[PDB]
């Protein structure tokens, strides 16, 4: 695969708004995120649509593609980071400068709607992109959880590429929709013990593919959707969905023969899942959809909309040890 240069303390991070104009609509949280990374020693380059609004989005399709492309053209930038997701990143895909991405590989990082770009860029270029922090939701998070997010971010992107990397498990996590865009917290978030579960036995090693599942529907069937292959590990997460929507998306995967191919599934923790009073969890819904197909599942990986968030390279081999309850990166993902 195509690999970007690793991150280092003091590097320049460029940010872009490929969908929701949250540098305006969540300006306080944005400023907190900016200050957080600056105090860590990073230099920041603001994308050209920072501070702009086109109602539900940061700008036109072409304006947003231009914003992203301009960061790719900047030789000083090591990391290109999403400000926030939304709904509309998939629009940009016909207009991204893929040749420039290949010529100037950089760390591309974000999550949620930005999945369209992460997956699309990988499909077109083979570049290993990252499911991880977006500036506003991830680094604008109040302490204590932001520190754990940062620890993963800096560890994954700066570590020496020697031997496997085994993930730490966050001690506590939260998904509460509070403390969003103000100077002070209203009150501390509920801190849940980590209830991540490893359903299965032995070790499964394979290329990880996926991201935000709802977002994948916007690129599905196109040349920008990476082909899922035999032996892949499917990584999927969703946010604030009804159980009805979760069944729909799982069945979509079933119909597409995804569950005939993959050797394991990683479910990211689902932020504020709405069970409609059924008290069922997404894993139970997946089990029904699977219809007896035995696939080992890591249920509740901390790489999703919940806090804290781990950083995950997409398109490289992972090993999930279901016996020892851990997950590792086993393939080089940066230069």
Ligand X SMILES: Nc1ncnc2c1ncn2[C@@H]1O[C@H](COS(=O)(=O)NC(=O)[C@@H](N)CCC(=O)O)[C@@H](O)[C@H]1O
Active site residues: 112, 237, 305
Beta carbon of residue 251, minimum distance to a copy of itself (angstroms, whole number): 4
Among 63, 70, 87, 321, binds a copy of itself (CB under 8 A): 87
Confirm or reject binding of residue 293 to a copy of itself (CB under 8 A).
Answer: no
CA 246/CA 273 separation, integer angstroms:
9
Beta carbon of residue 115, minimum distance to a copy of itself (angstroms, whole number): 12
Binding string, residues 156-195; x marks residues near ligand X by CB under 6 A? ---------------------x--x---------------
Size of the site for ligand X (CB under 6 A): 16
User: Which segment (81-89, 198-206, 257-265, 310-318) binds ligand X by CB under 6 A?
Assistant: 81-89
Beta carbon of residue 24, minimum distance to a copy of itself (angstroms, whole number): 14
Among 6, 59, 86, 315, binds ligand X (CB under 6 A): 86
> String of b and e for 198-227 (b: at least 16 CB within 10 Å)?
bbbeeebbbbbbbbbbbbbebbeeeebbbe
User: Which segment (48-56, 211-219, 282-290, 295-303) binds ligand X by CB under 6 A?
Assistant: 211-219
User: Which segment (35-43, 138-146, 162-170, 286-294) binds a copy of itself by CB under 8 A?
Assistant: 286-294
Residues paired with residue 209 on neighbouring β-strands, in sequence order? 234
Query: What are the structure tokens assigned to 237, written together?
Result: 């997460």
CA 59/CA 16 separation, integer angstroms:
11
Residue 153 near residue 132 (C-beta atoms within 8 A): yes
Confirm or reject binding of residue 257 to a copy of itself (CB under 8 A).
Answer: yes
Contact residues: a copy of itself, CB under 8 A: 19, 54-57, 60-61, 86-88, 90-91, 93-94, 217-225, 242-245, 247-249, 251-252, 254-257, 275-278, 288-289, 291
Contact residues: ligand X, CB under 6 A: 20, 84-86, 112-113, 137, 177, 180, 212, 214-215, 238-239, 271, 305
């Amino acid at each position: 695969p195509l690999l970007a240069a690793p991150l280092a303390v003091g590097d320049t991070i460029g940010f872009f708004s490929s969908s929701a104009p949250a540098t305006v609509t969540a300006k306080n949280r944005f400023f907190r995120g900016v200050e957080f990374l600056q105090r860590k020693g990073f230099k920041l380059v603001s994308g050209k649509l920072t501070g702009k609004t086109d109602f539900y989005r940061s700008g036109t399709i072409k304006e947003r593609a231009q914003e992203f492309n301009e960061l790719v053209y900047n030789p000083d930038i090591t990391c290109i980071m999403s400000t926030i997701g939304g709904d509309n990143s998939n629009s940009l895909l016909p207009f991204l400068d893929y040749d420039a991405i290949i010529a100037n590989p950089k760390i591309i990082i974000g999550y949620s709607d930005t999945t369209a770009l992460l997956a699309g860029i990988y499909a077109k270029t083979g570049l290993i992109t990252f499911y991880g922090p977006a500036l506003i939701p991830s680094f604008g998070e109040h302490p204590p959880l932001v520190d754990i997010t940062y620890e993963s971010f800096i560890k994954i992107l700066t570590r020496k590429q020697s031997g496997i990397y085994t993930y730490t498990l966050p001690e506590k996590w939260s998904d509460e929709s509070i403390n969003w865009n103000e100077n002070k917290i209203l009150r501390p978030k509920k801190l849940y013990k980590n209830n991540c579960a490893f359903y299965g036995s032995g070790k499964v090693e394979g290329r990880v593919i996926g991201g935000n599942l709802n977002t994948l529907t916007g690129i599905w069937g196109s040349e920008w959707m990476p082909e899922i292959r035999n032996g892949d590990i499917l990584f999927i997460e969703d946010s604030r969905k009804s159980i009805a929507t979760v069944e729909r998306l799982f069945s979509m995967l079933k119909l597409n023969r995804v569950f005939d191919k993959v050797s394991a599934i990683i479910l990211g923790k689902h932020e504020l899942f709405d069970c409609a009073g059924s008290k069922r969890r997404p894993y139970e819904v997946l089990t029904e959809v699977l219809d007896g197909k035995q696939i080992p599942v890591l249920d509740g990986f901390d790489c999703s909309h919940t806090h804290p968030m781990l950083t995950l390279p997409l398109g490289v081999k992972l090993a999930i040890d279901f016996d020892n309850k851990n997950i590792s990166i086993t393939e080089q993902y940066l230069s």
